[model samples]
Target: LDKVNLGGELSGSNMYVYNGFVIVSGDKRSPEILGYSTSGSFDVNGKENIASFMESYVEQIKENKKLPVVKSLLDSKGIHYNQGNPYNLLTPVIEKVKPGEQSFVGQHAATGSVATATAQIMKYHNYPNKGLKDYTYTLSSNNPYFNHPKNLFAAISTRQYNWNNILPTYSGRESNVQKMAISELMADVGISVDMDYGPSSGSAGSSRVQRALKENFGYNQSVHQINRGDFSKQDWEAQIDKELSQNQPVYYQGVGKVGGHAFVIDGADGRNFYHVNWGWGGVSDGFFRLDALYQSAVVGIKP
Candidate 1:
């Protein structure tokens, strides 16, 4: 904790992006509790720094001395700390794992779509052993497969084929490992794997959300698709609030300046933005303002 007296002005969590890093801070009394991360910077040192900062406050938070205080901070920032166990929340992308060749879709860019769908499924659904052999590797200090997409895909392979096999090392189209894992996971959860349809192929967001939800959840509830500039901000917020309150996740694609990639909405901050789990890995465990997605198409889902 810092010695300077912040004098209670910091009642809420403060978050920002500086130099391409997502930095979050708590009240001045708990100044040591800082959250900083990157997108694709999987260096062990970075993870260690974040781990240490959050660990210092573990006991304080566990004892519930500042229950609402800390919870509010975490919620406003979309930190996803998972009650002080940050490791379980922000998993990294597996490097050098080519999911394209392993993809049954042959060299298509559907992994992003699959990754988003499956991540939300895992967040709310259940499976055997959490669909992995063990967390030993995922929590290791030196293991590179810590919540890596390759591991997820590998687990699905193990479940589907009934045998243990390593992900094939091949030179081919770059497949997002998380996406591949989600596709296989979809199959594991009763959704048939057929083709990869997404923004790259002009596939509508409605189809993607419906197919994944219907097959996995037995029935798709209320779902709506909004194109760019077709809805008001008031309407957007109302709909988003309703679906998320029902434990439903939204899938979106930003246009032009926002982004062209696919992403999953796990939680929202109510005030300005929603927290997205970029199927790739940890660094992207950050927030995107509501306006950042205004011009993008969205598929609001309910289970």
Candidate 2:
């Protein structure tokens, strides 16, 4: 091993979006030493300039290390990046491939938001066989599957599946290949993706989440539609109790300025705030009061 020092003040991680992928990267010293990535592999989705820019940017960050954030690093050179939103969704919609005890930055880009959320949920619940679902993918690769949603669904219908470990652990990402592979097979089967820009661009609906949970992962999920206005702390307590009592994760989705974002209401304070894994690569994932959440959906699950 060698001394890899990207900088001194670099302590946390930074996120970047390129080629329809959300990436969580570590600081200069160990950019490859990031989350969900078992091996040192980095890609800019075929954008050689991004890789080149990161090369200089990483060096720039290592100088003083005063600014560890990617946005700050980019700003140092008058570069541009996506800040996304504060609550719910942000920046290009990301997925945390390799989630660990370390907050959420150790993540890779996901094909769709639905897969991103399920990647977190299944990993948290340790389903498809306990403690086995993982987020790393090593493949470097898609197809006519993008012609229609039916074609997409039909392809995944015949795709190989190992429910015991849906998201298999692999080396570092080969770009969006693994994510696309993951999205169609285990999680987003039979789902329609309206956006034709890419194959894995659409988010899965609720019934699909609960439905696919039982059909693919062998777990049963029960969902009830709760109006955002009528949902109260007592109601939050009632759902939070399911997590406390049933010993499983509770999934919730609420509307934001952009649209509905999926999350796992993992815990609560019994008073003011509730703990949430925002599922956007662990960004802004914390306890906060429920306010102005529109078109809410509270889902409690079991295996």
Candidate 3:
């Protein structure tokens, strides 16, 4: 944070932000559990977590008004301090997503297809938080980006954007959340919280991150446009290997001209390759060629 300038845009490539904290380290394939996103609140103690997107670390903790008045006079006498990472709603689910754990937000740059590819398909359909922990607590019964220890999956999709209202809730009718919640639900259609490459205010087209995953966490996803031109590259690699053998994690977009690019294809190689999770930060993730550069795409379909 440059001695407290706190600009933001840290990186662990996919998990492990620093200073203004956010550490759920690469679960197995790498990070192997280190420290965590030290306290900055995402759910309590004067609310607004992820250090409220570190605008100079929230004006040096709101001008250090004596550190929240000595922590509110030690909460009127019970004395408390370590209240890091709040929103707790973990259980047991997490199917699979290892190959370097996964998590890498931005400083509001190219939102990697609606907040990190819809947080890797809502952490493989656990729909956010079924189980997670680690910042030394080390508990992840199945895994879907830590809670109890306080928020993950890139600090609630790039520093809080309440993916359908976090903490056990799965869809809040009409309200919203998102460290950016799909780039603030895609800048409430005003366009531009940064997505893809063009950045005219980001996202020119690719259908509103699959229409905010079935209009906000309803997830019935299964759309395809592949350029609207009667497909034929072996019919787009056998329809992305039949939706990655049935939604192991599939959400993609690829336009041309100088814009459009999304991610999440989980795995594939039965013929032409497809294991892509380009949500940036993880740079050139893996597997390629589902059109490689043929451009013009927009794939989805998950169960």
| Candidate with best lDDT | 2
Could you arrange the candidates by TM-score from highest to lowest? 2, 1, 3
Cα miss at 264, model 1 (Å)?
1.6
The lowest-lDDT stretch of 10 consecutive residues in candidate 2 is 68-77
Return the TM-score for candidate 2, rounded to 2 decimals. Answer: 0.45
Model 2 agreement with the true structure over 1-303: per-residue lDDT tens digits: 222222222222342322212233445443332112122323433222223233433444354356400111111222111111111121122222222323233222233444444545554454554221222211212212222222222323334443433333323343455444334342332232211112223333344456555655556546434554675766755655655455555555543322234555555545444454444333334443343114354365665
Model 3 CA lDDT for position 121 = 51
Error of 1 at 95 (Å): 20
**Total backbone clashes of model 2?**
6
Question: Native-vs-model 3 lDDT?
Answer: 0.35
Model 3 Cα displacement at 90 (Å)? 24
For each of the candidates, the C-alpha root-mean-square deviation to the true structure, in angstroms, is 15.6, 16.2, 21.6
Q: Give the Cα error of residue 228 in candidate 2, in Å.
A: 3.3
User: Clash totals for all models, in order?
Assistant: 1, 6, 21
Each prediction's TM-score versus the true structure: 0.42, 0.45, 0.24
Model 1: residues >4 Å from true position, as ranges? 1-110, 127-183, 186-204, 215-217, 255-260, 292-300
Q: What is the Cα-based lDDT of residue 284 in candidate 1?
A: 38
Q: List candidate 2 segments past 4 Å from native.
A: 1-110, 129-150, 154-204, 215-217, 221-225, 229-232, 256-259
